């Protein structure tokens, strides 16, 4: 990592990250076969099986109405992902595709099937509960007496049907579209097999095998539905087409100039992540779109907002910039600390006590009025009035782009005051 | 469904939906009776019962501090729903009401009780763990020795207290107010019985018996608390007063006009769902307020914003409109794809590659500069630079309202530039 404190606009740009951008989806259609639980009935008292059979029947009948119907659409990453998943889900819903998938999965536990849409999917059968129900449960409950005294069947059924109950709970809570791949929809072995079956290069396979909990959080599951006795649901694993490209995170604080008790401040809107898919800067505003795991940053291209390559001029000279740079201006600012990945930049004004100090020396020093950058090497704790912030313990290359603050030269007495999405090259000439 | 692309403001309006508006609440007060678990004690080692008895005691002790106290209020749908629920919760908290409810539920498993507030609630007793604990859990634990060798009661207790433990976990995680009715608070049989007991017409009963997976999400549960040995909590099922009235979703993209490298664009802020409760348009700004399940759209009237019927002029002619139509204007636009329920409208500007193509033909065509509407029949995939979007597979009636873009006639060289809240009728004349 390498963090540069741009003093002109009072911002911090942290480079040295590496992109992992999800570009596509890979469909793994699981067919959890339950069996003929509906035909089996119990009329005696609670015998450790009638209660569990009733719970299984309730789950199966509850799954019928939680079919993941077509959404309302949108523009965010989750809306595009849901639409893309439902596009293949509706093709699967047709009788021909489901019949072919079940037929090919009847003999073997895995299929590589091409749908009528032209997409290739991996069909997985997890029919372990069905085998137990058909072989053991029906044999012991040939009659209507469910009070078998072996007690083996009760605990075995409790163990086998746990995954089905968890799947039902997740799909009912999430209305058929779970937000992430849990440990119940697709286990570790199935995840490894699906990754090994994916059509992708060796480096992406290695990266996705190392970070299994970031592949379980970028994907999701969609419930095709209950056909006959089989609950069929698809899992959309991510495919990271763009990998190992430079990224940088930009954080901003309100830079202020004041006189006679009147302030004038600017804060950059262009905070968040920037990456480069292929010769085109992509800007992610929301911090929930991109998640960092080490030096790698995982992002979704659906939420990416394309930005021109000229946007790099915002980090060089905004006073005489050619590309219009976005700044929100105001007066009577807000004192706050923005924790950069390496250090932290603090901007406190008016009557606010501000200090930095380590854990073994005490209060190292006080902050002069105006925003300041604090590395994690020269300080360990930042105090703002009474609030205490603990800085990071990561190491990196800290630089300071020396210069004059821009807001120091824009007449702090009175300013045009353009707040929401106003540039600087033309709005504040 | 039927989607019309208005080219005057470059926005897609999709009609043909049917409202399901939650207008009221129905209270189902569950009294989960646990028993005299506190009196029982185990002094031996782990005997498959001491561990579970300790877990039950810990859950019961934890439930004391997670009482759903009165909230801080608010203006959203969740705040109003919480306040309405707590209004009956405080009435139930009185000793007379809870004593009467428990007295009527002592003999029968269901009650229809009228509170002193005047509201009518359905009292349900799920006292299955209590019976086992009282008679045949305690029969073998007359002494302090919990190491019974039959081993059947251990697994039976594990089966019986699962619902209680799940309820405790949900109420502790959600601080007493769960966001939705899970499978543990109210099972499918109890949900169906409560629906059958509700005072509503046959149409609503059929609709919400075919859509239990959305009724479980539109409701919630509030914990009254632990009285004696009984955990009392109410579930607030939704009552859909206004049903099957026309609704339409409006989505917008930035319509732009540019010259000499200078842009000027407008985007409609009034995106989202519109419905008609009774002769009055209601607008839902947040996309999480309304959820579509097929052609029906389920909404909450608490989050609705009343809008005058004159707002229909926003979809006919905004250049010479009488009703003030809200637009957010700006330059230096954003290239993005808004996925309409039927098709998708793409607005890409500056140096951004834009194309559409099917899955078989390849790249069908290249999109000219300016926002364009793409149906799901003439194209199957939309490519913007590197990002790829898959269109929906639903069928409907697509229309294009031909005309001239409004922003094309408002001097793209320089424009008043009001973004957050201004109307095109008398701010951008």
């Amino acid at each position, epitope marked *: 990592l390498k963090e540069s404190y741009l003093e002109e606009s009072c911002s911090t740009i942290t480079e040295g990250y*590496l992109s992992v951008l999800r*570009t*596509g989806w890979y469909t793994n259609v699981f067919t959890l076969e339950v069996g003929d639980v509906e035909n089996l009935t119990c009329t005696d008292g609670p015998s450790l099986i009638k209660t569990e059979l009733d719970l299984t029947k309730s789950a199966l009948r509850e799954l019928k109405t939680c079919s993941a119907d077509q959404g309302s659409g949108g523009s965010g990453a989750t809306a595009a992902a849901v639409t893309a998943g439902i596009a293949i889900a509706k093709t699967i819903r047709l009788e021909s595709e489901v019949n072919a998938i079940k037929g090919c999965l009847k003999t073997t536990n895995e299929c*590589v099937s*091409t749908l009528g849409n032209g*997409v*290739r999917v991996l069909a997985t059968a997890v029919r372990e509960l069905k085998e137990f129900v058909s072989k053991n449960l029906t044999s012991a409950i040939n009659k209507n007496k469910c009070d078998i005294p072996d007690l083996k069947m009760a605990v075995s059924f409790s163990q086998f049907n746990r995954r089905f109950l968890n799947v039902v709970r997740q799909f009912s809570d999430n209305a058929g579209i779970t937000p992430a791949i849990s440990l119940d929809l697709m286990t570790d072995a199935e995840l490894a097999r699906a990754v090994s079956y994916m*059509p*992708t*290069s*060796a*480096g*992406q396979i*290695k990266l996705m095998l190392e970070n299994r909990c970031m592949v379980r959080r970028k994907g999701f599951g969609i419930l095709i539905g209950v056909y006959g006795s089989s609950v069929i649901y698809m899992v959309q694993l991510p*495919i*990271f*087409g*763009v*990998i*190992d*490209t*430079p990224c940088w995170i930009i954080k901003a604080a309100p830079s202020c100039s004041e006189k006679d008790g009147n302030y004038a401040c600017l804060l950059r809107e262009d905070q968040g992540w920037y990456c*480069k*898919n*292929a*010769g085109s800067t992509v800007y992610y505003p929301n911090d929930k779109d991109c998640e960092t795991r080490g030096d790698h940053v995982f992002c979704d291209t659906a939420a990416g907002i394309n930005v021109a*390559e000229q946007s790099r001029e915002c980090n060089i000279n905004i006073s005489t910039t050619n590309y219009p740079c976005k700044v929100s201006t105001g007066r009577h600012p807000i004192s706050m600390v923005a924790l950069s990945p390496l250090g932290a930049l603090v901007a406190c004004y008016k009557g606010v006590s501000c200090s930095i100090g380590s854990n073994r020396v005490g209060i190292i020093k006080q902050l002069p009025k105006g925003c300041s950058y604090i590395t994690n090497q020269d300080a360990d704790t930042v105090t703002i009035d009474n609030t205490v912030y603990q800085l990071s313990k990561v190491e990196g290359e800290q630089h300071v782009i020396k210069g004059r603050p821009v807001s120091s030269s824009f007449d702090p007495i009175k300013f045009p005051e353009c707040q929401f999405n106003c540039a600087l090259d033309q709005v504040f000439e | 469904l039927k989607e019309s692309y208005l080219e005057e403001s470059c926005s897609t309006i999709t009609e043909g939906y049917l409202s399901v508006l939650r207008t009221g609440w129905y209270t189902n007060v569950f009294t989960l009776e646990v028993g005299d678990v506190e009196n029982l004690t185990c002094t031996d080692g782990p005997s498959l019962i001491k561990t579970e008895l300790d877990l039950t005691k810990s859950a019961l002790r934890e439930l004391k501090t997670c009482s759903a106290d009165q909230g801080s209020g608010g203006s959203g749908a969740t705040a109003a729903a919480v306040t309405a629920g707590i209004a009956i919760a405080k009435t139930i908290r009185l000793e007379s009401e809870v004593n009467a409810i428990k007295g009527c539920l002592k003999t029968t498993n269901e009650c229809v009780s009228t509170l002193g507030n005047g509201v009518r609630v359905l009292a349900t007793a799920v006292r299955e763990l209590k019976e086992f604990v009282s008679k045949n859990l305690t029969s073998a634990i007359n002494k302090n020795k919990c190491d019974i060798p039959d081993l059947k009661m251990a697994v039976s207790f594990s089966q019986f207290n699962r619902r209680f433990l799940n309820v405790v976990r949900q109420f502790s995680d959600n601080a007493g107010i769960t966001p939705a009715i899970s499978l543990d608070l109210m099972t499918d049989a109890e949900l169906a019985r409560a629906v059958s007991y509700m005072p509503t017409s046959a149409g609503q009963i059929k609709l919400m018996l075919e859509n239990r997976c959305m009724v479980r999400r539109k409701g919630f549960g509030i914990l009254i608390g632990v009285y004696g040995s009984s955990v009392i909590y109410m579930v607030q099922l939704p009552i859909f007063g206004v049903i099957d009235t026309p609704c339409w979703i409006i989505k917008a993209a930035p319509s732009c006009s540019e010259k000499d490298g200078n842009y000027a664009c407008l985007l409609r802020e009034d995106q989202g769902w519109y419905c008609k409760n009774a002769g009055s348009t209601v607008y839902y700004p947040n996309d999480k307020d309304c959820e579509t399940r097929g052609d029906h759209v389920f909404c909450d009237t608490a989050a609705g914003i009343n809008v005058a019927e004159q707002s229909r002029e926003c979809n006919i002619n905004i250049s010479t409109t009488n009703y003030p139509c809200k637009v957010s204007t700006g330059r230096h636009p954003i290239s993005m794809v808004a996925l309409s329920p039927l098709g998708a409208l793409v607005a890409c500007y500056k140096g951004v590659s834009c194309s559409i*193509g099917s899955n*078989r*033909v*390849g*790249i069908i065509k290249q999109l000219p500069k300016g926002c364009s509407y793409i149906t799901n029949q003439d194209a199957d*995939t939309v490519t913007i630079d*590197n990002t*790829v979007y898959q269109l929906s597979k639903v069928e409907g009636e697509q229309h294009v309202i031909k005309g001239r873009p409004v922003s094309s006639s408002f001097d793209p060289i320089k424009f008043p530039e009001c973004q957050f809240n201004c109307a095109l009728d008398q701010v951008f004349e």
Partner: single-chain antibody
Amino acid sequence: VQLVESGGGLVKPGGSLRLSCAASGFTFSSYSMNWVRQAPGKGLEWVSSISASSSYSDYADSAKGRFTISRDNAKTSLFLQMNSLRAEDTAIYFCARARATGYSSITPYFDIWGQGTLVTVSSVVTQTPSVSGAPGQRVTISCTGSSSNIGAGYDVHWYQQLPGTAPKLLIYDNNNRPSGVPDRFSASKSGTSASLAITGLQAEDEADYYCQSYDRNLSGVFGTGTKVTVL
């Protein structure tokens, strides 16, 4: 935008040779790069890869360890060092950019190629050996592959190479088409085989056509090379 090549000099067998490729006109730090060698008379062959930050690098399963690849983003330069090259390494080497849509499968396509340099000493996909005909009508070229290259879900790309000319991307991502290519070229992939159809070919279409897909075993396999002729 172009990739100047250098370093293709005569070398004795068992020696070392350094080839440099300088790319001008694009962000060199965001594009993966590749080496493709073509023997004097045979088809194109993949050599080595390099990512956008030199963290992942894959090699063809014929010169692992023997060759090495590196890049420096400071001056936007790339280098290939060949150590102890054999007598079969006499070929024209092309430094090629790489782009991957990644929507369905990750199969990079070599959109921009360098002129290449000549080096001399002192589950493979296959397609039709050659096609012929007359101007005016339609011709087809079929590139068949095993279950690891096209049957594994990987896409198929088609490049057209004139005699004594750097190859040019013709079809990318199954059936799409780049700018500057006439619409008379069409492509279609089915199951395990791809097909390129040329409708109403002119006299300037006389060039070799190569199909490129991705393997699970040996990455970046190229086709055997079909030659079209015009009467």
